[PDB]
RNA sequence: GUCUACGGCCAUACCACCCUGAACGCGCCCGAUCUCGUCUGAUCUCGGAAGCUAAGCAGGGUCGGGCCUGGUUAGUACUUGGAUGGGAGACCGCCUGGGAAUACCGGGUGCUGUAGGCUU
RNA sequence: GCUCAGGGAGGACAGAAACCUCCCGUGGAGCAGAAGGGCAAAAGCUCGCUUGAUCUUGAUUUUCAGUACGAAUACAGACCGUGAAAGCGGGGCCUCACGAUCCUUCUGACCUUUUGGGUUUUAAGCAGGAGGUGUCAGAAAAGUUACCACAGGGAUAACUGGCUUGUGGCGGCCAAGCGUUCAUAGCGACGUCGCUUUUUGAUCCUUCGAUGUCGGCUCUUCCUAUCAUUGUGAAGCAGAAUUCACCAAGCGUUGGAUUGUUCACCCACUAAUAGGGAACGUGAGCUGGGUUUAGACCGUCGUGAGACAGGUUAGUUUUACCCUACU
RNA sequence: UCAACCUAUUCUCAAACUUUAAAUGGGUAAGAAGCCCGGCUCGCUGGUGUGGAGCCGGGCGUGGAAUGCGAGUGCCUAGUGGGCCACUUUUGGUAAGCAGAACUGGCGCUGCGGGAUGAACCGAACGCCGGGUUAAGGCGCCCGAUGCCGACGCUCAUCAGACC
RNA sequence: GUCCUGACGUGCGAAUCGGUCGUCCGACCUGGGUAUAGGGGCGAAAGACUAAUCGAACCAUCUAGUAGCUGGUUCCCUCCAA
RNA sequence: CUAACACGUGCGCGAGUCGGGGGCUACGAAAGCCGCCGUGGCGCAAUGAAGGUGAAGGCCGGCGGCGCGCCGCCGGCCGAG
């Protein structure tokens, strides 16, 4: 879909509509040092292979796609994550349409 | 299989525990062999206090 | 037993085969007949039938107990409030009826009547089609007169 | 035949207490008599509250009998309990109260005699009152018990406040998934 | 196995009658609802804003709630063995009042008035309805004429 | 009798054609400086009063179409309940009850609330 | 603010179809999609301004156990959009467009714990999204067995028997026509009504603590829908021959070449070489050629173990003294 | 002329069409928790001691259709989760002692009289007996009962007919 | 150890007998000694043989392995009953 | 049969209850007793993840405080729907 990269939306923190830079949220390192990480880390350490199970029917082609939501405001500058219904192809802020006109 | 309504419980019965059960039918053959025990020590020190020090 | 029919005949106090209840008729009455139709046969009884009904068979549901009315002051404890004392006005509160004719035929127990002699002339079809339920209108004074 | 429907043909109700204590018995051979022999219902009443169970004659205790006796237009009447009259230690004075009991406890025998009053068992209660006039029938709190905190709606059901089996309470024990609503619903 | 949408098998009901299909009329608005108020269900195909859900078209309930567009009523439904008196949220116009409440009310006032009336006076007047009894005894006057004799008209094949 | 402004129920009010409209109105009408908006003062907006019922609209007419509402169709079709009824079946008859719709033939053609005029 | 599909009548090139205008036009269009509802100064089309597709706690509906998730409905608390305003709006006119725990990631607060105290990184929490389980209330998962096993199932196949008769077989009825002539000697279209269980299907009721599953040989009995023989009626019956029909199953209905054959075809005699039933008669009667174990070879398929209503070769056929029946 | 067209007419239809539109059926109501007054409170709504709602206080009993019946409520809980048949409605199927639904009744769990025989049909539901009477079905004989001086007809079959 | 697919098939025999058969100077037949051990041996290859046991011996134990699957489940009367 | 849990029921004591582990004095390995052997279990208090917090109010008098009739706090009174 197309989303413009600016939503004038609510904020938390100043607790009124405040201007936002919209980005898309994607997923950050996974950390070595997780409690889960090293936990299973350790349980792998060893004999038995593989211990926790390996998703493989992996079914649906889409995800959700978050934005994420800086305020713009300069001392405040609050994040939400905003996910909307999913889409296969998405942009942020390209080509705003306009009827009546030649292809 | 549990029924309605009521308490889910984990006993810890999955060992075998048949073979070790400590049985307490000595228990009054036991205090009796301990104040035998302790009048046979009271007696033979005799003018020391019973409970030692 | 159709269950609407099983519980019209519940309200009716028909509940063994070859009972009997007087009932008195109005609009939501012939409805509730007429929904038993096939079960009943049901008529205009003579003071004839209700004086035999009443003296051969009729027992007072008492105390919910079924004491036969040998006397007249089982009646007259259980429906002297009404101001009916004997069972000459018994009959004629249910023969003329009367303002509490709901009390008098709540009093009087479902009579219970024996099998028709010389016998019916058949059970499963109406009494217009040659049989025996339905509304035989006068002609259920030929048939009191055999069930007891 | 008959079509009467024969599920509800018994009365479950009892006729004898299932005690076989024997002067529980012959406080039933007394009331018997004279719920049979008089027509005052407070003998009715006082003998199927003899017959009951002791999860359904539940102990009241005194707090509750203070306040229910001082409640106003009730001055020296007798108040009659068929089950435990227990002491209540947060209350200070009591005032002179006139009580029937089958077993009042130790502390409140003294409790009430100190305060200057009188305890009856039920034979001095028919023979002070044989129809039972001058009385006022108490009985304790019936759904105090704890167990009643385990029935009804079951939790894990909207709008149920019903305390769950759990073997004990704390931070893991049955707090995690019915109950947040980040940890997959709250019900 | 039959789909379980929120409107399944409602052709026919939350349709407009033929011909009054358009503008909704505005007394089914202007129309107040206290609390209290027994009120019929008849949802409407022109709005789509607060349904009232299959199960409910034509069901009858009690107003326990009204609010700036919808009020909220208590109706029975009948599920496999037992009845539910639910809430649910309806917009104002799925929604007539009962007139078989007004009638029971006109019935109360006029034996209240026939009451206070005719205890000054000492008669005693009928309150409850008794049903339609059987018929009494009347003459029947043939003024004149014979009645007109009947016979079945015989059969002829007009196919 | 009637109209305007706001309406309610939304054709007994619609649609086609014709006739008649006194007084107040409603209109058509004459203009574009300003408010406003267009390719265009046609619309919308704005400023008016020379004229006209021509149209709108109002009232009325048509062996009018429609609609509304009765009769007929018909106790027909269908139908709750019943029979150890008929028939090889298909289906049909009967008893106890309830009971439609076309075609066809008549009647009707807006009622009315609140505010304000007109008929000196 | 405007009216749409379609149609009519006009207009330079212009046409069946570009564009301009007038008139009719109750939706015959459009509203993303599948359909159903819904809609005309709108929910449609074109503009102008926008981010209620936002923050938040409750209740209710929907499937429902009256539980979750999803989706939805009235509210309520702010922060806004728009309009002059009433109002309308917390996604799509309504009905589908979607996902638990554990784990990871991101966001939030001058937040909590980080363990004897303090500071600082890190980690744990609390709430809110996301990564997903499509077997969609949510395991991480390739085959083969003919070397096979075990617990069972007649809940479930392959036989027979059962209800049915599509299909197979057989027989009517009506009469367009063939039979030079002539509907009906002998046939019979288009249609139509049946019978039989000697085909095949359909079903799965019986049998899975087993009813021995192909044929042939031997042997008795039965049916008639009769090939012949006895007696008759009909012919487009001159004779000879042959066709159709009736009573009718008493008596027959064979020898062989090929094939495991049931079937099939051929040679020869014939009076005739008709059809069938009895658990698709008959294995404690036989035979074992075939299919239907384990050994093998070949073709195709498979990476492979191996598979083949494909062919070929070798491959244990058990028991009567019981009762009944018959001799 | 033959066409499309167009206008009134005519023949036949519709599970996924419809202006009309039944029967059966589905909710609600048929009072004391209701009416009628007097008055206070509210931060909600407000031209308006407005509107609504809540609280007090008082007065009203012909208990406001028929009919039947003593009711409400709380624990703990086994077994069950292979079903089948029938009047009618009805889906696939040519059809089925076939498969799949709806209403109700049965069978299963159930005898007993009748249908010769029979899980389901018709009657009828059961403690052990004596008397009487019936139901459905019967009455030549088997076999209780027509051994009625029963009534009225139809019917000859070299394949007669004979009871859901 | 071929064929009779003969005998016998609760036998003489848990593989025997009869007639017919193959080979019978060489990869021959055979006694005793020794070696190889079970997921191992050994195989002129059949998944054969490994003490009447073989597509993984036998014996003890774990062990009463587990089983949504069959079989069974012990006295009377009364009441309610799917 | 042992253990665990739930509910019903009988019994003692009752805001408490229990000595089961220990000790003191033929049947008797029983029985009794302890109480400064109630350590402890369960209960009498919940909630929160955690830091933690931890279960009636009003009336009277004095001092819009101003465009806390409310009252911030003191003394008295009623006092636990
Ligand atoms: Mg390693
Ligand atoms: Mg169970
Ligand atoms: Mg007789
Ligand atoms: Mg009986
Ligand atoms: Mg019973
Ligand atoms: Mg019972
Ligand atoms: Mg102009
Ligand atoms: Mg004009
Ligand atoms: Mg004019
Ligand atoms: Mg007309
Ligand atoms: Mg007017
Ligand atoms: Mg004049
Ligand atoms: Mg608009
Ligand atoms: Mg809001
Ligand atoms: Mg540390
Ligand atoms: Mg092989
Ligand atoms: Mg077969
Ligand atoms: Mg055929
Ligand atoms: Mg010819
Ligand atoms: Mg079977
Ligand atoms: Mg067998
Ligand atoms: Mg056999
Ligand atoms: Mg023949
Ligand atoms: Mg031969
Ligand atoms: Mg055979
Ligand atoms: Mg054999
Ligand atoms: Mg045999
Ligand atoms: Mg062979
Ligand atoms: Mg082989
Ligand atoms: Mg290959
Ligand atoms: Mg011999
Ligand atoms: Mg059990
Ligand atoms: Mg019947
Ligand atoms: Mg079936
Ligand atoms: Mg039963
Ligand atoms: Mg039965
Ligand atoms: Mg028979
Ligand atoms: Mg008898
Ligand atoms: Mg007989
Ligand atoms: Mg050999
Ligand atoms: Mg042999
Ligand atoms: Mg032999
Ligand atoms: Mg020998
Ligand atoms: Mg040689
Ligand atoms: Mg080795
Ligand atoms: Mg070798
Ligand atoms: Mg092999
Ligand atoms: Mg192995
Ligand atoms: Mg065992
Ligand atoms: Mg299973
Ligand atoms: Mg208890
Ligand atoms: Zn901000």
Sequence with gaps: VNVPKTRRTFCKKCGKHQPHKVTQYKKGKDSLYAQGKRRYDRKQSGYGGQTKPIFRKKAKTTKKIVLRLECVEPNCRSKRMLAIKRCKHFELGGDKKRKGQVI | ?53 | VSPKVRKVLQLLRLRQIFNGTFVKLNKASINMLRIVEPYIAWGYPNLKSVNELIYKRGYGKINKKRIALTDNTLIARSLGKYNIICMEDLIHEIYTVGKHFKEANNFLWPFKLSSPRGGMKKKTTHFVEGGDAGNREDQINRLIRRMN | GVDIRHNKDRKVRRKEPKSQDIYLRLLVKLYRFLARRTNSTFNQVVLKRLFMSRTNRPPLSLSRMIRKMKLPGRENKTAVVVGTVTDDVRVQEVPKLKVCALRVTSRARSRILKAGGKILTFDQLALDSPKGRGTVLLSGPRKGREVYRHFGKAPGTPHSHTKPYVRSKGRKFERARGRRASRGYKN | ?159
């Design chain 2, 1 to 53: 299989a549990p029924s309605r309504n009521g308490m889910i419980l984990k006993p810890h019965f999955h060992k075998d525990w048949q073979r070790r059960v400590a049985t307490w039918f000595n228990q009054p053959a036991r205090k009796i062999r301990r104040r035998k025990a302790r009048q046979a020590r009271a007696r033979r020190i005799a003018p020391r206090p019973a409970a030692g020090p």
């Design chain 5, 1 to 159: 196995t039959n789909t379980k949408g929120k409107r399944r098998g409602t052709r026919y009901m939350f349709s407009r009658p033929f011909r009054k299909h358009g503008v909704v009329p505005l007394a089914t608005y202007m129309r107040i609802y206290k609390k209290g108020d027994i009120v019929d269900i008849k949802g409407m195909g022109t709005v789509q804003k607060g349904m009232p859900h299959k199960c409910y078209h034509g069901k009858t309930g009690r107003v326990y709630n009204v609010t700036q567009h919808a009020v909220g009523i208590v109706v029975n439904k009948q599920v496999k063995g037992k009845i539910l008196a639910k809430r649910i949220n309806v917009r104002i116009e799925h929604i007539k009042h009962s007139k078989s409440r007004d009638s029971f009310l006109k019935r109360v006032k006029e034996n209240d008035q026939k009451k206070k009336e005719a205890k000054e006076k000492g008669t005693w007047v009928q309150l409850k309805r008794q049903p339609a009894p059987p018929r009494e005894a009347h003459f029947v006057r043939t003024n004149g004429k014979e009645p007109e004799l009947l016979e079945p008209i015989p059969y002829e094949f007009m196919a």
